[model samples]
Target chain A: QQEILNRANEVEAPMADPPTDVPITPCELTAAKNAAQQLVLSADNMREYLAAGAKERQRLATSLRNAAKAYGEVDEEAATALDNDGEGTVQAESAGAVGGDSSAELTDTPRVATAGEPNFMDLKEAARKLETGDQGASLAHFADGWNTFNLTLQGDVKRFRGFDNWEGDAATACEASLDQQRQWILHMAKLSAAMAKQAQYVAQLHVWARREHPTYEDIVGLERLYAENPSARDQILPVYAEYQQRSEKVLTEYNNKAALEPVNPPKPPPAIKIDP
Target chain B: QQEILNRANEVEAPMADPPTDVPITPCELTAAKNAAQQLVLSADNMREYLAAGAKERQRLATSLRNAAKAYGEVDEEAATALDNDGEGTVQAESAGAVGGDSSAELTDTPRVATAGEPNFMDLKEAARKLETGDQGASLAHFADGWNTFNLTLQGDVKRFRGFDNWEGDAATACEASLDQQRQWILHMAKLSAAMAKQAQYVAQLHVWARREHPTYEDIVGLERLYAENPSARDQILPVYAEYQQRSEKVLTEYNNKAALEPVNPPKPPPAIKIDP
Candidate 1:
């Protein structure tokens, strides 16, 4: 499911060079600008989503700082152990690095309706790192994770202007317009759900780390002991359990909301009439 | 001066439609997107300027309300006479209405460096209206005035995507690229000065209005009586005089600042190499 979502976000390979013999028509020029505007709006939405997360991120950062300070106060080893000077890094997904992809299109089956589930193990590890590591690093990990995805979305938007040429009639252009709109909305829905999950995971991670914990080693041992028992992990960390429930809600709401939105692809411009 | 400035801002008549036989090259494709990005960035700057003015606008509104109340306390005629029902209206500039113009290019001898001097007479009229007029209407006038120009700039940006079909080789594309960047910077410089002028004008207007005045008629009478002596108008209304002085400064500073900035147009991409 994750791989499919990743692929859906990727721009298809660039088309072969357009021959320099045929100049673009007025119709094609108009269509191309329309396409560019759609891309611009999509980039705007992604940017807004990233911007809106700022407050949530600030809260998470405050908690991480508090956790790091508290953990450091308990022992010298803990303070020295954390690599606090740098932020966490997130690798690029299948769609290429931010601003890398130079084209975008909708795949035949855009299985993007479902949100990716939060990785509990990763969340758990991040929480522990915050409790026993650097506040800046932990904060950056989540920040980079969210931003990397947004950059991919933005890159797709910026590069999709490559499709700014259409040689066909308005009828064919209309079909392409509908597909473009669908792809835009689908990406929007996916980003919305992903944003929700990111904030939720960060919030839950903060709660778990802020709670009383014996030690980093104790957490590792407890998890190791419960490795064979799937339900035991959730029982031990109610915050993780809560995050799971919320993740499911993200998926459900995204699918239903996307289903309800009317793509309402615009009708092609009417043919020009001439006097007989 | 205004007419010349308006003409400088206008998108020239578009080129004739491209012939159907010539297809756009990769160079044109890249150049067009680069042009589109420049447009997008310009629009973003304009939008940010408008957004940043919100707080200043709010302050102006608050002062207008206070002035209205103070004036109303003195005379029922004053309260009733002030056309407080609707905002002052601004006509679209020469480039066309917001989102109207579909192309943007720098004019030869780009005289965009100097900021437009704020209208002292108009500001005085607006101040008088606010002191005696409806708060909502007065607020709308300034808000719309600022927004309309921003829209004109935005429309030029959105429609300029029409240049998405450059058919030339790398060298000509490079010249076009350089031209596009310079236009973008000019518009940015123009908008920065405009934004500064807008905030300063509003602030000065609020000050002129919030001060105690005998009656709206006295201001009008004083202005009419001093019509022959320009300096007499300044002596009687120091705030208007102050605004005039400040407007001159805005133009002076904008010119110097724009002159100092480097456009640094990107070197054209080297032609692709094919080893013999």
Candidate 2:
């Protein structure tokens, strides 16, 4: 995978030609300057968010681990009842990277539910209610599921030996999460800088192009160059796709809301209405 | 400044030519894999550090601003005392960043000092002591200079009017610092990603080159390619530079400990004249 990356570096070319002219004006530089400022503020803000998120994850991992380990101290029959199902594994089988999206999602849609057996369904219900504005119920479900996960089964079994191993598993997961988040932060930092760097040149290019007003041939050449590189198209194509996908979610949620109420029936013709 | 970056993106030449068959074993991939992980960990960690540093700068700005603004409420005499100092600036000349290297330095080499008017000299002394081992003196100097800075003059002048503006100045300085630090983070991030990508290709090439055992012609051709593009040198050179620099620091620290005493000065070297 990295082979090409190395070779590209080995044979990467230097700028054979450099841009000779760039234009600047009092007003023209505002957007560029504004963009630069926004870029700076956004990045620091993002890194802080990521770091804080990682901290929370670490805490969660610790809490979960402790909860799981404590289960072993419970009476054998009760512990087995909480942990065992058809499968011999730790969980009743949950999906990948449990608790999708930010944990804050749980806070927003807390639901009104009583504490009960920690079952797989509670999590799903909680997420849905959280989405639907059932904050109390959502909160309750999440809490129940959270509590159940630790007490009944190993927090993570795929990597560990038994219930006692949950703490270590949790620690590893939290650490990995932190590390990955860190990578995310750095990757974004670079992306922002690279994009900002790219922006300056484009800003210059636009200014130059508008002032110079290139001929038809030049315009054609620009198009030709654009064709030689299709990054613009590739970058933009996803927006429509993403928009449509999001639009579908809007439809699904609105439909659910509509189902809770009734719609007016069609009215009869004017003549029939007058007779009535 | 970013012209080349944009141009590279705009007129990017796809490496459609493809690489000829290359590589030996799974073992070879280990080094490459290791590089990627280390690269990931390092970048994220760096970003976090930068982000945290920016936060401190932000807080500094806030605190300084508040202090400067509070001078107005101190009454004529108190405010005058706090605001007056020949030139009219918040700082009584604090040293580089008011504390360079590490604040921990103060913990190492503390020295005895009597209370006195805070002056420009204390901060410098603090830093020097910090470098040595006078943690106490370092701490005192920094603290004294810090307190002195709050009372002296305009914390900020460009935006605000007078001694009251001192806070604004500090706030402005801090904002700028944070902004610059943010920029630094991104630039490094992109540098890291760029280098990591470069790493992958080279790992592939080395494996390919080593196992294939190319001829003198192939080697010569490779040299020609290398000459065609020198970025390969530009890219990897820094990691090694950084590593070696870090290694040197490690050696310095370790050596300091070793020199605390000696390991048996072997039999007072035989009167070498007799040996001769």
Question: Which one is best on lDDT?
Answer: 1
How well does candidate 1 match the true structure in TM-score terms? 0.22
**lDDT (C-alpha) at residue A219 in model 2:** 32
DockQ of each: 0.01, 0.01
Sorted into a CAPRI-style docking class, model 2 comes out as incorrect
Residues A1-276 of candidate 2 have per-residue lDDT tens digits of 132222222212221121111122232222223333333333334333434433333323333433333333333445565668645666543322222112321111111111111112222222232233211232233223323333211212122111222234434554354344334434433443443343343344333323332223433343455422478667544533453344333322322221110111111111100000
Per-model CA lDDT versus the true structure: 0.33, 0.30
TM-score of every candidate's chain A: 0.24, 0.23
lDDT of 1 by residue, A175-263 (tens): 34334533453454456345434433433433333343233454566566653466865576774456444434443333232222212
Give me the chain B TM-score of candidate 2.
Answer: 0.25
lDDT of 1 by residue, B1-276 (tens): 232222222323221221111111221112122322332333344444333222222222222222233333433543343433334434322221111011122211111121112222343443354345332233234334444454444343332222322232422432343344334534544564454344334334333333432234545655666544778655756755555444333422332222221121211112221111
Q: List candidate 2 stretches off by more than 4 Å.
A: A1-276, B1-28, B69-276
Candidate 1, lDDT over the whole model = 0.33
Candidate 2, B200-225: lDDT as tens digits: 34343433323332233433443455
